[PDB]
Design a protein around this ligand. Sequence first.
Ligand code: CU
Length: 108
Amino acid sequence: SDKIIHLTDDSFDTDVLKADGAILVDFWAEWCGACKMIAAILDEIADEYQGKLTVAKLNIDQNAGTAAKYGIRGIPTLLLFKNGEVAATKVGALSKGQLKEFLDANLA
Ligand SMILES: [Cu+2]
């Protein structure tokens, strides 16, 4: 958790939309079982990709406005932003290897 940005409706603009570079945002909630493994994988990704990718979390129960703005329909959902714009999304659980594939697919 030490390398994960904690986002809210009130910090999303500054921390994501105005952030230079790539940010991977995990839309989650406590009641989401699949979200638990995603979190464990994301800690490793955040560590391994330091300097190249920032990882962040947005709790959809607590920040329904942001969830609505991005059309979140189910969780987990990962949104990859580059320079403040959505570059890719992945809905539903995936393995660490699949996530690394998903990220590689988005390299310019
Ligand atoms: Cu940590």
